[PDB]
Amino acid sequence: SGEYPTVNEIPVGEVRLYQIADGVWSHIATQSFDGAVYPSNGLIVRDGDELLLIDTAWGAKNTAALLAEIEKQIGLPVTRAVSTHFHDDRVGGVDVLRAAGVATYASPSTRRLAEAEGNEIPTHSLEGLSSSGDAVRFGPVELFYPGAAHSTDNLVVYVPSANVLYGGCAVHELSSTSAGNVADADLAEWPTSVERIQKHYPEAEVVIPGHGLPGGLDLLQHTANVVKAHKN
Numbered sequence: 209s210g211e212y213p214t215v216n217e218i219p220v221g222e223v224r225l226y227q228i229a230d231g232v233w234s235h236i237a238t239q240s241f242d243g244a245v246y247p248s249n250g251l252i253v254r255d256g257d258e259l260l261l262i263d264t265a266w267g268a269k270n271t272a273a274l275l276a277e278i279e280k281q282i283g284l285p286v287t288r289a290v291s292t293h294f295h296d297d298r299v300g301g302v303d304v305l306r307a308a309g310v311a312t313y314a315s316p317s318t319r320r321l322a323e324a325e326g327n328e329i330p331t332h333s334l335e336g337l338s339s340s341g342d343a344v345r346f347g348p349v350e351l352f353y354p355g356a357a358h359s360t361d362n363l364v365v366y367v368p369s370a371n372v373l374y375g376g377c378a379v380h381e382l383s384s385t386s387a388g389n390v391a392d393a394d395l396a397e398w399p400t401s402v403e404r405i406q407k408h409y410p411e412a413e414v415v416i417p418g419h420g421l422p423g424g425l426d427l428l429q430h431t432a433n434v435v436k437a438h439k440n
């Protein structure tokens with residue numbers, strides 16, 4: 209009823225949308241992995257009379273439910289999707305998107321990692337993002353490669369019209385007490401990558417983590433803090 213949705217409100221298989229700003233929504237879904245249930249976020253950005261999707265809803269059936277929820281709540285076609293790294297909470301559902309006529313994109317680094325791991329593979333390669341600090345435009349967003357953090361390929365997304373920073377899994381929510389699933393992370397580089405985000409996007413007004421509650425710029429420093437304490 210207006211608060212940011214959580215698992216307790218999200219059975220696995222259902223998707224909720226949350227209005228972040230004019231023409232910007234997050235999507236929230238839940239999934240089981242290794243016997244525990246997790247929420248995860250993605251982004252939807254209005255692109256004229258079409259929509260740009262950032263990240264799947266973590267699974268094929270969740271992603272089908274996402275498309276149905278978008279039709280119900282927004283009613284504009286999703287034409288393109290970008291996956292911000294290679295894990296199943298970002299690419300699981302790309303086959304559903306592709307069969308629904310959505311053009312799917314990711315960096316070559318994400319595509320290679322997805323392929324090697326056996327995850328779903330976005331169709332199109334996003335060049336221009338291979339060095340830390342790189343940025344490119346993609347419809348109504350800027351894509352930014354901050355360097356290795358949660359994964360070596362993680363991208364962040366900025367919505368300039370609304371000063372919305374979508375950190376993806378490189379950014380954690382304020383209530384977090386650990387740095388999430390760090391199996392593919394670079395804990396030593398992560399703070400430097402966060403510092404690059406902070407320098408590049410100092411006017412961000414909303415910061416959205418890959419999992420959990422949006423907040424403000426404090427999510428960035430908090431993420432560095434939890435990662436440094438994990439490493440140590």
Ligand SMILES: C[C@H](OCC1CCNCC1)c1cccc2c(-c3ccc(CS(C)(=O)=O)c(F)c3)c(C(=O)O)[nH]c12
Nearest residue numbers: 241295296297377380384385386387388389391418419
């Ligand atoms: C789909 C992804 O696959 C990872 C692979 C690694 C090893 N090879 C197989 C798959 C995955 C699976 C399960 C959990 C997570 C999480 C995760 C875990 C805990 C918390 C709560 S917290 C901040 O307080 O620790 C949280 F927010 C997020 C994250 C993430 O951190 O991005 N990613 C996850």
Ligand SMILES: [Zn+2]
Nearest residue numbers: 293295358377
């Ligand atoms: Zn991940």
Ligand SMILES: [Zn+2]
Nearest residue numbers: 297377418419
């Ligand atoms: Zn994640």
